[PDB]
Amino acid sequence: SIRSLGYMGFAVSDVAAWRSFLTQKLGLMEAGTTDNGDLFRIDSRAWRIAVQQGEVDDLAFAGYEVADAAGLAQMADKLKQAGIAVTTGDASLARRRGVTGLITFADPFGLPLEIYYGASEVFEKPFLPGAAVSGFLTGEQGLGHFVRCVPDSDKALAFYTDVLGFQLSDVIDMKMGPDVTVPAYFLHCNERHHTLAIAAFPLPKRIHHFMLEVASLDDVGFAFDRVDADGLITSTLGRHTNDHMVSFYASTPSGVEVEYGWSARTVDRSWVVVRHDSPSMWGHKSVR
Is 259 among the residues that bind Fe ion (CB under 5 A)? Answer: yes
Give the one entry of Fe ion, a copy of itself, none that residue 239 binds, where binding means its C-beta sits below a cut-off of 5 to 8 angstroms depending on kind: a copy of itself
- Rounded to whole angstroms, the Cα distance separating 111 from 176 reads 25
Burial class (CB within 10 angstroms; exposed 0-12, middle 13-18, buried 19+) of 144: buried
Tell me: does residue 8 bind Fe ion (CB under 5 A): no
**Closest separation between CB of residue 282 and a copy of itself, Å?**
4
118 by Cβ neighbours in 10 Å (0-12 / 13-18 / 19+) ranks as middle
- Part of the chain binding a copy of itself (CB under 8 A), chosen from 16-24, 35-43, 115-123, 194-202: 115-123
> Of 193-222, which residues contact a copy of itself (CB under 8 A)?
217-218, 221-222
C-alpha 161/C-alpha 21 separation (Å) is 34
Among 113, 174, 200, 281, binds a copy of itself (CB under 8 A): 281
Question: In a 10 Å sphere around its CB, with 0-12 CB exposed, 13-18 middle and 19+ buried, how is residue 286 labelled?
Answer: exposed
Site membership for a copy of itself, residue 270 (CB under 8 A): yes
277 binds, among a copy of itself, Fe ion, none (CB under 5 to 8 A by kind): a copy of itself
Query: SS3 of 266, please?
Result: strand
Q: Is 55 annotated as a binding residue?
A: no
Q: What span, in angstroms and rounded, lies between the C-alpha atoms of 172 and 201? A: 13
Q: φ and ψ at 209, to 5 degrees?
A: -160, 165
State the Cα–Cα distance between residues 162 and 160, nearest whole angstrom: 6
Q: Which residue is nearest to Fe ion (CB)?
A: 167
What's the closest the beta carbon of residue 53 comes to a copy of itself, in angstroms? 27
Minimum Å gap between C-beta 87 and Fe ion is 29
Q: Report what 281 binds from a copy of itself, Fe ion, none; CB cut-off 5-8 Å by kind.
A: a copy of itself
Helix (H) or strand (E) holding 78: helix 69-81
Cα(71)–Cα(66) distance, integer angstroms:
6
The nearer residue to a copy of itself, 54 or 74, going by C-beta atoms, is 74
Say if residue 126 is exposed, middle or buried (CB neighbours under 10 Å; 0-12, 13-18, 19+): exposed
Q: Is 154 in the site for a copy of itself (CB under 8 A)?
A: no
Nearer to Fe ion, 8 or 211 (CB): 211
Instruction: Output 219 or 259, the one with its CB closest to Fe ion.
Output: 259
Residues that bind a copy of itself (CB under 8 A): 3, 65-69, 98-100, 117-124, 126-129, 131-132, 140, 168, 170-171, 217-218, 221-222, 224-225, 228, 236-239, 241-242, 244, 246, 270-278, 280-283, 285
Binding-site residues for Fe cation: 145, 209, 259
